[PDB]
Design an enzyme around this catalytic site. Structure first.
Site, PDB file in Angstrom:
ATOM      1  N   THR C   1      38.050  51.573  45.115  1.00  0.00           N
ATOM      2  CA  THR C   1      39.018  51.771  44.489  1.00  0.00           C
ATOM      3  C   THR C   1      39.423  53.476  44.533  1.00  0.00           C
ATOM      4  O   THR C   1      38.503  54.200  44.103  1.00  0.00           O
ATOM      5  CB  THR C   1      37.875  51.736  42.445  1.00  0.00           C
ATOM      6  N   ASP C  17      45.597  51.932  44.532  1.00  0.00           N
ATOM      7  CA  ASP C  17      45.276  50.677  45.860  1.00  0.00           C
ATOM      8  C   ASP C  17      45.630  49.483  44.710  1.00  0.00           C
ATOM      9  O   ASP C  17      45.768  49.513  44.056  1.00  0.00           O
ATOM     10  CB  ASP C  17      44.046  50.790  46.403  1.00  0.00           C
ATOM     11  N   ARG C  19      42.023  46.663  45.654  1.00  0.00           N
ATOM     12  CA  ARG C  19      41.703  46.260  46.003  1.00  0.00           C
ATOM     13  C   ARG C  19      40.218  45.875  45.293  1.00  0.00           C
ATOM     14  O   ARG C  19      40.678  47.447  44.326  1.00  0.00           O
ATOM     15  CB  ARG C  19      40.770  46.384  47.373  1.00  0.00           C
ATOM     16  N   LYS C  33      45.769  48.601  39.272  1.00  0.00           N
ATOM     17  CA  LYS C  33      45.050  49.367  38.390  1.00  0.00           C
ATOM     18  C   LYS C  33      45.767  49.962  36.844  1.00  0.00           C
ATOM     19  O   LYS C  33      45.824  50.577  35.513  1.00  0.00           O
ATOM     20  CB  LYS C  33      44.802  49.890  39.008  1.00  0.00           C
ATOM     21  N   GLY C  47      35.875  53.370  39.125  1.00  0.00           N
ATOM     22  CA  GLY C  47      34.845  52.951  38.212  1.00  0.00           C
ATOM     23  C   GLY C  47      34.381  51.245  38.146  1.00  0.00           C
ATOM     24  O   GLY C  47      34.760  50.297  39.161  1.00  0.00           O
ATOM     25  N   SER C 129      36.483  55.485  44.787  1.00  0.00           N
ATOM     26  CA  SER C 129      35.728  56.397  45.919  1.00  0.00           C
ATOM     27  C   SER C 129      36.704  56.876  46.825  1.00  0.00           C
ATOM     28  O   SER C 129      35.884  58.230  47.709  1.00  0.00           O
ATOM     29  CB  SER C 129      35.004  54.913  46.584  1.00  0.00           C
ATOM     30  N   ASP C 166      38.953  54.612  53.689  1.00  0.00           N
ATOM     31  CA  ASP C 166      37.570  54.490  53.039  1.00  0.00           C
ATOM     32  C   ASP C 166      37.332  52.894  52.552  1.00  0.00           C
ATOM     33  O   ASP C 166      38.659  51.926  53.485  1.00  0.00           O
ATOM     34  CB  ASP C 166      37.494  54.643  51.351  1.00  0.00           C
ATOM     35  N   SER C 169      38.872  49.939  49.196  1.00  0.00           N
ATOM     36  CA  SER C 169      39.941  50.327  48.739  1.00  0.00           C
ATOM     37  C   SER C 169      41.057  50.388  49.780  1.00  0.00           C
ATOM     38  O   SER C 169      40.955  50.785  50.334  1.00  0.00           O
ATOM     39  CB  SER C 169      39.794  52.495  48.418  1.00  0.00           C
TER      40      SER C 169
END
Lengths: 240, 230, 219, 204, 240, 199, 233, 232, 239
Positions: C1, C17, C19, C33, C47, C129, C166, C169
């Protein structure tokens, strides 16, 4: 019908055999108790509210006998009718503005303020225990979108937009004259208000007997014209 | 604290006299008209406009409740504002809970319930408004009429307010099931035009339409256009 | 995220993203999102996914109701205010680190509201993240008054850096361009990954599965 | 882990006009297999099954409260619940217990009532509705099912190949788990009929 | 304040709750409604007052509501109050199905509601519901059942009964024409159209002036079905 | 975080750094720590930025109702009594610190300190995590009777010192001078921070 | 119609005047206080032979030393009796001693003017108790008989008649009573007056009788004892 | 909430609402009981024969526990409320004492309840008189009558409902130890009683029976009619 | 009639309960105040109803806060209740806002409080008027006069009670804008001795108070010497 009445229809807010609410209609009879007449009109640039001011006792502190009430930094207010009820709706309206500002992050538009207050007088015209606040609150405020705003809420809960209006004893002749002038068209505006009100009263006011509020597009902050400036507009009326 | 007993009591004949009187109040309200086409629903209501001082564009009788539902009333205005805010509240609860636009039959069931709660609660009078709720979803039109007593009727086309009897008799001879939307609007505006008394303008009659694209008010320009050809 | 934002001359643009993991395992591949708030005010979600969903949906309802009430466009100041009072009342348990953006009469405004209630207007931001890489590239290439194309490619560089750099994500990047004219949900802007095919067909002829008990119900 | 106190994993999977929901049948306390016919796939309509997993009491409690709100909905409405409506309902219900959460990780599988479009979704134990297109899983042995499904799933499989795929998915996926298995139940949801099938799983 | 209290929860000088009996007058003016209990099923037949106008008939029936898997209810009189009662019954039966994992028998449901109507009739001072209800529902204890409840909260099981307009003539015709334990579903249809033909004074009976829904058993499941119009015309024609 | 206020004759000067850091990586490298409570009453936030924001907003609400109801600009002592009450009533739940400063007809410039829910007027009321590194400087360079430019260059120097040493403070330095004329919002870019002994 | 808390033009609550008129319809009860203790006899006024005579109990126990006679709305006095019982037993629990008579009649006398129709946090009492009690008992101060009425005034009395024929009977109490009276004389005297006042012919069934002596607990005379005392007539 | 004082004294000391509730009982379907050696019988008049009627759900002789059953008359709904409250309270008594309730306990309970609604805010008095019959754990027979005023009594055999004057005159005349020596003389006593007031005695006001340590026994309508011809 | 409760407008729109309550204030004894250059002064025609009462019984000059005085009239218990409400008001304002409450806001709050009882049938109006005095370096002297209707007006000279008219005609004889407290006290005295109908309702007391410069803004009753010189001069002006 034709003034028919049954049971407690003449005592509380329940529908008589016709469908009227005798308590609300009597409340409109109650705005005439104050013996006043207020006016608000709006031109393209500003919205002006002019009222009587009867200080008969001479011991009255003239600074506090006023029907103008700064609701926010940008919202005028002129009451009419019973006094203490008007005071109370002023407190409630101020609380509404502060709460709209707190929850919603911006100045409450006049339309939502007077809408809200009308919602709080309707509750009186529907529950049976408390009476309707006998005082027709007029507002004036400059929204950045629609411009000069003047809304009139009354004990019946109604409210609407206005190019002019008047509240008090002489609402009839006031609105009649304002018909006769709006049909004949606003920069001075104030000259219109004082001319109309002084006409229906036929007093030739003195600069201390009235009050004036203005909210202009150039100046959003509601403001009160002193007896000196009202003296300016009056003397500007006499000299034509 | 407030009165806790109901103010509406069964008269000795058993007919709730307060709801007779409230219905008389709606019967005196400004005339309204609704008709259901094959693809949508029209709402047009008469502006009992006093002095030209009124900012007619300041408040409207035909308020949307979501993207697909309308309301017109007949009678007491402020009461109507109560029912509008209540309806918007209900449709929003439904949208949070089920994630779907509220079907109009449902919304009329709930708002009908709220109109009923005050014919029975403590020290409140019944409302004085008769709603017309038009709604579209499932590719289908809806038009309901709620009364002060709380009951709601599903209609093809209806009329209420001043002179609602001659209005309904006017619709019985002029409503046909295959009427497209615009010709429906023509029929409604003619219906009001029967007993307007005042030479309708694009300022003093409101027109609402609900179709597959959603509900909205027709601006006084467009309503002026429909006020052409009549 | 790894969600990010950006502000250019005409309006804002939100990244995201696609995922959503379950503690070690990529649950979804195409989770949305950039949620909906008002007709031009969008709210990205980082989050706790459930709490961003529920929070932004409730506030979506209050802004819809309010929007019919005032007969006006909703102002993003309102959305951020209700969001941060709702978030603040719960004392940070509702870990929904929104980044709300929109276009008011005042101009494009990209707020960022963290889980305890601390909001902060600013011209570019990236939560989640992958806020490290996204903050990196946005810091490195941002300019006041960017072209909408440079904004789109720039944000895609950002959320991309989150994607590759990352773990939690990945998938595709989603950018939504908001302007004074209206919103355009440019779903699945770029698709870095290509691994969608394969070379081993794993089919079992009917009958390879040992069935014990049976029943059929006509409808 | 409170979730693995009873064990058990349920998956759905999407085909060509039919979504198949599976489940294991081992109701067990931590290490003690207690029952082999514990129900986890509760019907919610003519063509809509909501497979739950996790702690047993949240399985049955979420299933029964959901059936409560669903019968109230269908009665008060005039219609069976559309799968997306059901998903938002269950997500609301798990989320009302945001801080005392039901330890259930439901997956909902079914068809549109009218158009009969396949539908699935999985949720977490606080209600993050995650509609998908290929499949979902849930329960103590999620990972093995992600492997077997992700390797076995293909686009547009008719019902029968679907039963083969979900069959081998559940079998292989649960045999590599201790706290699940003891048989497998499978439901195919076509447009016109609904086939229930239990499978021969390792009884150990 | 005490001037305004109607005192809806007090006895009369002869021991008769005025509000409950006035309510019985209201339901006395409602549309007649009657169902019959038979061996192979149960049917309800209610005179509709949505007769005939520009109504839309968006619903499947007027006075028949579905309560659980296995029951159905018919109201008479105050439509709104009938709505509130129906919603309450659905809530009761579904709470019983939550708390016991089986359908609720008719007797328990009727008692749960009639305790409510009694509750308003006793204290709280609210007006009683002016809504009589006829129920039909199957349960694995006692078979097909018919429960009449009225505003006073009193109820009773019946084999066939009629509430509303001309209820006296209807129950009279049932007394003359009910064969206890030997009425079939179709015999029930014919008799019901008999009683409704004789009672409804509006004059030639149509398919539009009534509706009938029947409940029976089918394959371990209960079926609650409304009669389509063709079947109604067929059964009235057969009645001729 | 290093917010600072100073009292001089015509009004005050509220300097404040412009960083809010999350642990060891910063979240916002520009953040105005001076949110107005009225036309001429600023509160310098610190601590829990969310908590400080909620207190600034509630305090602005009460100060605005009380402001209009009297029809006269609310005295700073009023403001620091409402922020003092809201910081004391919740002291177990708010890690906030609000050096509320401003002007008013009846008293002139004021800078009230409200750490932990207490109320103490002070000449210069520095706060924030970086404030523990400038007590030496401010004590050595504060002389009562400062002209406005002395106050502005002074607090700029002090917050500059705190920014060079402290990790919880960095970025730009906001300065506002509240007087009878009005507020004069100014910003100090990182290229303008007065350089001190760097080694 | 008016409220329950209205004062008349004379200065008394209506409901207490009409209630003290309602007590005038009850069956006459009488008890007398003596230095040996206090007795209590009350006419049952049986209405039909189908009744159980032991059913009508107008002289009930409040504790081991307090016997509570009553007259009037016998239904209302149940809340008074249970109130007093809970009182004296809580007093025993907390303070580890028997409760004085004045304390009991004062406590139970606090629920006599506790009625209204607007405060009503619960559905509290909507009218004054239509009960006239006569708490009898012995304590460290010795024998005492405290009258009580709907108006809540509890007064110490040497001997008092309450109920329908309580006026005449009370004239008999001032006629016969004297301080040095012995308790059996009290029983005989009171039965004489009741026999004067009762409509029906007296017997050992349509009355009861109890006493509480310095060492004796509360006690209700059975049929045989009542007959043995009525042998004197 | 509604807190008006419905039940208030009147200018004679009367509680008019109580006299009116007792009026409602005096129009109730006449009921009778008797207390025998080992049996307790209750009879409830006819009430509403109405050939379409269902018998089972229109009886006036409900069970309160294994050893406590009750008739009544008047506002049947109200009596359904009181019956319900008494049932819940019986079971709460078995929870807090382990001993089944004496008839005195449950009767004095319901008398307390009726007394409270005679004397509280916004509540009308019940219009029910309940003749609760039952067996104490020692097995003695028990008849307690409770009226809307709340005053209750033990009874040998007492009749409630409309015309309870004439029927009570009947049990005053015919209740003798020869009358209740046996079961059938007892039940022919009850039905012999109501037959003065029950139109077409035989199959109208069927009854109920309870034997010592035996659960409530009920007619047996044909067996009612045996006694019918046996007395007519 | 139509006058059975405040929540009922007449056919002419007059809440008869408020007007009646005003007729209750007008039956009481007149009290007067005069705002002047440096403060406010209060007199009280406190009729003593019997020789038994203590000198100081039934005081009608309260202290709602140390910078605000209060002179009442009419049904006196209600005046005391306004004392408790006002005292709670100033206390709440000092705890909220940390300084002495401006009297204007205090008569706003109290005026809303009295007004809160003229809308319901559940309660009746306060049948009592009253005056508030205050002095402060920030706002000078101020005098507000709440009546049963709840309306708040600022006066240079006020009078409430039974002889309100005569007290007004007496107050208009003054140039109170140009007098100080120590001279105002005499004139208020002369006012009370003049307006008092002596032969009817004899035997009153004079109970004075001011608040201003000489008392440092602290409202305090008049010194006995000043009250006695005042009565002496006023009585001498009667003659």
């Amino acid at each position: 019908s034709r003034g028919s009445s049954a049971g407690f229809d003449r005592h509380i807010t329940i529908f008589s055999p016709e469908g009227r609410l005798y308590q609300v209609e009597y409340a409109f009879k109650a705005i005439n108790q104050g013996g006043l007449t207020s006016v608000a009109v709006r031109g393209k640039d500003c919205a002006v509210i002019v009222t009587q001011k009867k200080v008969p006792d001479k011991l009255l502190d003239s600074s506090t006998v006023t029907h103008l009430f700064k609701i926010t930094e940008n919202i005028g207010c002129v009451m009419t009718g019973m006094t203490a009820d008007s005071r109370s709706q002023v407190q409630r309206a101020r609380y509404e503005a502060a709460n709209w500002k707190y929850k919603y992050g911006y100045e409450i538009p006049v339309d939502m303020l007077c809408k809200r207050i009308a919602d709080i007088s309707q509750v009186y015209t529907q529950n049976a225990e408390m009476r309707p606040l006998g005082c027709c609150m007029i507002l004036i405020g400059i929204d950045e979108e629609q411009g000069p705003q003047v809304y009139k809420c009354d004990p019946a809960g109604y409210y609407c937009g206005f190019k002019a209006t008047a509240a008090g004893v002489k609402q009839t002749e006031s609105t009649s004259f304002l018909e006769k002038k709006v049909k004949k068209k606003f920069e001075q505006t104030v000259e219109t208000a004082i001319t109309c009100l002084s006409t229906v009263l036929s007093i030739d006011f003195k600069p201390s007997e009235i009050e004036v509020g203005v909210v202009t597009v150039e100046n959003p902050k509601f403001r009160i014209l002193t007896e000196a400036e009202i003296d300016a507009h009056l003397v500007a009326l006499a000299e034509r | 604290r407030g009165y806790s007993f109901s103010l509406t009591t069964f008269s000795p004949s058993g007919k709730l006299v307060q709801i007779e009187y409230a219905l008389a109040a709606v019967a005196g309200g400004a005339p309204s008209v609704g008709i259901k086409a094959a693809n949508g629903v029209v709402l047009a209501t008469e502006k009992k406009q006093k002095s030209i001082l009124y900012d007619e564009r300041s408040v409207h009788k035909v308020e949307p409740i979501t993207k697909h539902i309308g309301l017109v009333y007949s009678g007491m205005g402020p009461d109507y504002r109560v029912l509008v805010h209540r309806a918007r509240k209900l449709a929003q609860q439904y949208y949070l809970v089920y994630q779907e636009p509220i079907p109009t039959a449902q919304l009329v069931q709930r708002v009908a319930s709220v109109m009923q709660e005050y014919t029975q609660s403590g020290g409140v009078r019944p409302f004085g408004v008769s709603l017309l709720i038009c709604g579209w979803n499932e590719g289908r039109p809806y038009l309901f009429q709620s009364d002060p007593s709380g009951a709601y009727f599903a209609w093809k086309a209806t009329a209420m307010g001043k002179n609602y009897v001659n209005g309904k008799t006017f619709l019985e001879k002029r409503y046909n099931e295959d009427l497209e939307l615009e010709d429906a609007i023509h029929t409604a505006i003619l219906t009001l035009k029967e007993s307007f008394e005042g030479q309708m303008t694009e300022d003093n009659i409101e027109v609402g339409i609900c179709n597959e694209a959603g509900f909205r008010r027709l601006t006084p320009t467009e309503v002026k256009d429909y006020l052409a050809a009549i | 995220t790894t969600i990010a934002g950006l502000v250019f001359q005409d309006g804002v643009i939100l990244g995201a993203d696609t995922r959503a993991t379950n503690d070690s395992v990529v649950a979804d591949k195409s989770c949305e999102k950039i949620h909906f708030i008002a007709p031009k005010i969008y709210c990205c979600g980082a989050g706790v996914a459930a709490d961003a969903e529920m929070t932004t949906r409730m506030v979506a309802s209050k802004m819809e109701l309010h929007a019919l009430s005032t007969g006006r466009e909703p102002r993003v100041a309102t959305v951020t205010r209700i969001l941060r009072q709702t978030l603040f009342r719960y004392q940070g348990h509702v870990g929904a680190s929104l980044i709300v953006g929109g276009v008011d009469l005042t101009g494009p405004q990209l707020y960022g509201v963290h889980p305890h209630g601390s909001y902060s207007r600013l011209p570019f931001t990236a939560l989640g993240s992958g806020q490290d890489a996204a903050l990196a590239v946005l810091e490195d290439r941002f300019q006041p008054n960017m072209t909408l194309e440079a904004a789109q490619g720039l944000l895609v560089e950002a959320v991309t850096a989150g994607i590759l750099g990352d773990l939690g994500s990945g998938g595709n990047v989603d950018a939504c361009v908001i302007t004074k004219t209206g919103a355009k949900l440019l779903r699945t802007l770029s698709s870095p990954t290509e691994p969608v095919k394969r070379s081993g067909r794993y089919h079992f002829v009917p009958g390879t599965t040992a069935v014990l008990t049976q029943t059929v119900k006509p409808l | 882990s409170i979730m693995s106190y009873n064990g058990g994993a349920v998956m759905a999977m999407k085909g060509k006009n039919c979504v198949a929901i599976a489940a294991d049948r081992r109701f067990g306390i931590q290490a003690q297999m207690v029952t082999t016919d514990f129900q986890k796939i509760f019907p919610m309509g003519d063509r809509l099954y909501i497979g739950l997993a996790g702690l047993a009491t949240d399985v049955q409690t979420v299933a029964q409260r959901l059936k409560f709100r669903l019968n109230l909905y269908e009665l008060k409405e005039g219609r069976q619940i559309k799968p997306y409506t059901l998903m938002s309902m269950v997500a609301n219900l798990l989320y009302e217990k945001r801080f005392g959460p039901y330890y259930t990780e439901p997956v909902i599988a079914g068809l549109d009532p009218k158009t009969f479009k396949p539908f699935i979704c999985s949720l977490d134990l606080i209600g993050c509705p995650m509609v998908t297109d290929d499949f979902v899983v849930s329960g103590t042995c999620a990972e093995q099912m992600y492997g077997m499904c992700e390797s076995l799933w293909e686009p547009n499989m008719d019902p029968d190949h679907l039963f083969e795929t979900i069959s081998q998915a559940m079998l292989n996926a649960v045999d590599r788990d201790a706290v699940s298995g003891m048989g497998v139940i499978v439901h195919i949801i076509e447009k016109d009929k609904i086939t229930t099938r239990t499978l021969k799983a390792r009884m150990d | 304040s005490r001037r305004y209290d109607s005192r809806t929860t007090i006895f009369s000088p002869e021991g008769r709750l005025y509000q409950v009996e006035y309510a019985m007058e209201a339901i006395g003016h409602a549309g007649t409604c009657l169902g019959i209990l038979a061996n192979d099923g149960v049917l309800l037949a209610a005179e509709r007052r949505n007769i005939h106008k520009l109504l839309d008939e968006v619903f499947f029936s007027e006075k028949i509501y579905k309560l659980n898997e296995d029951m159905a209810c018919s109201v008479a009189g105050i439509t709104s109050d009938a709505n509130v009662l129906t919603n309450e019954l659905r809530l009761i039966a579904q709470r019983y199905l939550l708390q016991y994992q089986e359908p609720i028998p008719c007797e328990q449901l009727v008692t749960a509601l009639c305790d409510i109507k009694q509750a308003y009739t006793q204290f709280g001072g609210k007006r009683p519901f002016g809504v009589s209800l006829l129920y039909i529902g199957w349960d694995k204890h006692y078979g097909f059942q018919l429960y009449q409840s009225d505003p006073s909260g009193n109820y009773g099981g019946w084999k066939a009964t009629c509430i509303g307009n001309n209820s006296a003539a209807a129950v009279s015709m049932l007394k003359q024409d009910y064969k206890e334990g030997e009425m079939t579903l179709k015999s029930a249809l014919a008799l019901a159209i008999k009683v409704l033909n004789k009672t409804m004074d509006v004059s030639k009976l149509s398919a539009e002036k009534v509706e009938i829904a029947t409940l029976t058993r089918e394959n371990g499941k209960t079926v609650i079905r409304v009669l389509k119009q063709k079947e109604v015309e067929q059964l009235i024609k057969k009645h001729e | 975080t290093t917010i600072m206020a100073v009292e001089f004759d015509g009004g005050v000067v509220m300097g404040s750094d412009s960083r809010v850091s999350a642990g060891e990586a910063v979240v916002n490298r520009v953040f105005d720590k001076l949110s107005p409570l009225h036309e001429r009453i600023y509160c310098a936030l610190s601590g829990s930025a969310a908590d400080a924001q909620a207190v600034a907003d509630m305090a602005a609400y009460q100060l605005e109702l009380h402001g209009i109801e009297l029809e006269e600009p609310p005295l700073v002592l009023a403001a620091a009594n409402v922020v003092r009450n809201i910081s004391y009533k919740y002291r177990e739940d708010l890690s906030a610190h609000l050096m509320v400063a401003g002007w008013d007809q009846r008293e002139g410039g004021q800078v009230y300190g409200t750490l932990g829910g207490m109320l103490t007027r002070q000449p210069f009321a520095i706060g924030g995590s970086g404030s523990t590194f400038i007590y030496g400087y401010v004590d050595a360079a504060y002389k009562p009777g400062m002209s406005p430019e002395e106050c502005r260059r002074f607090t700029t120097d002090a917050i500059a010192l705190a920014m060079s040493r402290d990790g919880s403070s960095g970025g730009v330095i906001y300065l506002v001078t509240i007087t009878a004329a009005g507020v004069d919002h100014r910003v100090i870019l990182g290229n303008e921070l007065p350089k001190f002994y760097d080694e | 119609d008016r409220g329950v808390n209205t004062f008349s033009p004379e200065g008394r609550l209506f409901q207490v005047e009409y209630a003290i008129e309602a007590i005038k319809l009850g069956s006459t009860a009488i008890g007398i206080q003596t230095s040996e203790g206090v007795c209590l006899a009350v006419e049952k006024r049986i209405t039909s032979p189908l009744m159980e005579p032991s059913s009508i109990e107008k002289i009930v126990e409040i504790d081991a030393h307090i016997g509570c006679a009553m007259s009037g709305l016998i239904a209302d006095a149940k809340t008074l009796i249970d109130k007093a019982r809970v009182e004296t037993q809580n007093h025993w629990f907390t303070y580890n001693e028997t409760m004085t008579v004045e304390s009991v009649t004062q406590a139970v006398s606090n629920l006599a003017l506790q009625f209204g129709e607007e405060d009503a946090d619960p559905g509290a009492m909507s009218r004054p108790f239509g009960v006239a009690l006569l708490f009898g008992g012995v304590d460290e101060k010795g024998p005492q008989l405290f009258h009580m009425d709907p108006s809540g005034t509890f007064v110490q009395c040497d001997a008092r008649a309450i109920g329908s024929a309580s006026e005449g009977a009370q004239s008999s109490l001032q006629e016969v009573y004297h301080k040095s009276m012995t308790l059996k004389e009290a029983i005989k005297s009171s039965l004489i007056i009741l026999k004067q006042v009762m409509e029906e012919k007296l017997n050992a069934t349509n009355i009861e009788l109890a006493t509480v002596q310095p060492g004796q607990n509360f006690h209700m005379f059975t049929k045989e004892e009542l007959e043995e005392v009525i042998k004197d007539i | 909430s509604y807190d008006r004082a419905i039940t208030v004294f009147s200018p004679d000391g009367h509680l008019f609402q109580v006299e009116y509730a007792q009026e409602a009982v005096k129009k109730g379907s006449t009921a009778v009981g008797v207390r025998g050696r080992d049996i307790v019988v209750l009879g409830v008049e006819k009430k509403s024969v109405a050939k379409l009627q269902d018998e089972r759900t229109v009886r006036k002789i409900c069970a309160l526990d294994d050893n406590v059953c009750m008739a009544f008359a008047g506002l049947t709904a109200d009596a359904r409320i009181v019956i319900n409250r008494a049932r819940v309270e019986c079971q709460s008594h078995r929870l807090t004492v382990e001993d089944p309730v004496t008839v005195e306990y449950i009767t004095r309970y319901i008398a307390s309840l009726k007394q409270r609604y005679t004397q509280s805010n916004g509540r009308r008095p019940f219009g029910i008189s309940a003749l609760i019959v039952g067996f104490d754990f020692d097995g003695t027979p028990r008849l307690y009558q409770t009226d809307p005023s709340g005053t209750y009594h033990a009874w040998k055999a007492n009749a409630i409902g409309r015309g309870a004057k004439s029927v009570r005159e009947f049990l005053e005349k015919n209740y003798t130890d020869e009358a209740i020596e046996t079961d059938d003389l007892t039940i022919k006593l009850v039905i012999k009683a109501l037959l003065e007031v029950v139109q077409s005695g035989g199959k109208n006001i069927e009854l109920a029976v309870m034997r010592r340590d035996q659960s409530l026994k009920i007619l047996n309508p044909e067996e009612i009619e045996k006694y019918v011809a046996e007395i007519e | 009639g139509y006058d059975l409760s405040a929540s009922t407008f007449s056919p002419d729109g007059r809440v008869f309960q408020v007007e009646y309550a005003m007729k209750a204030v007008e039956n009481s004894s007149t009290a007067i105040g005069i705002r002047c250059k440096d403060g406010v002064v209060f007199g009280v025609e406190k009729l003593v109803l019997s020789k038994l009462y203590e000198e100081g019984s039934n005081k009608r000059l309260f202290n709602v806060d140390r910078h605000v005085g209060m002179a009442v009239a009419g049904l006196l218990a209600d005046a005391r209740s306004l004392a408790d409400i006002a005292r709670e008001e100033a206390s709440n304002f000092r705890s909220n806002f940390g300084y002495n409450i401006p009297l204007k806001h205090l008569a706003d709050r109290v005026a809303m409080y009295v007004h809160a009882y003229t809308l319901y049938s559940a309660v009746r109006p306060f049948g009592c008027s009253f005056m508030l005095g205050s002095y402060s370096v920030n706002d000078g002297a101020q005098l507000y006069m709440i009546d049963p209707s709840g309306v708040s007006y600022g006066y240079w000279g006020c009078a409430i009670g039974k002889a309100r008219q005569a007290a007004k005609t007496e107050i208009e004889k003054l140039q109170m804008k140009e007098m100080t407290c120590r001279d105002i006290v005499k004139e208020v005295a002369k006012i009370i001795y003049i307006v008092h109908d002596e032969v009817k309702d004899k035997a009153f007391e004079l109970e004075l108070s001011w608040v201003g410069e000489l008392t440092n803004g602290r409202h305090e009753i008049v010194p006995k010497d000043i009250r006695e010189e005042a009565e002496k001069y006023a009585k001498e002006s009667l003659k």
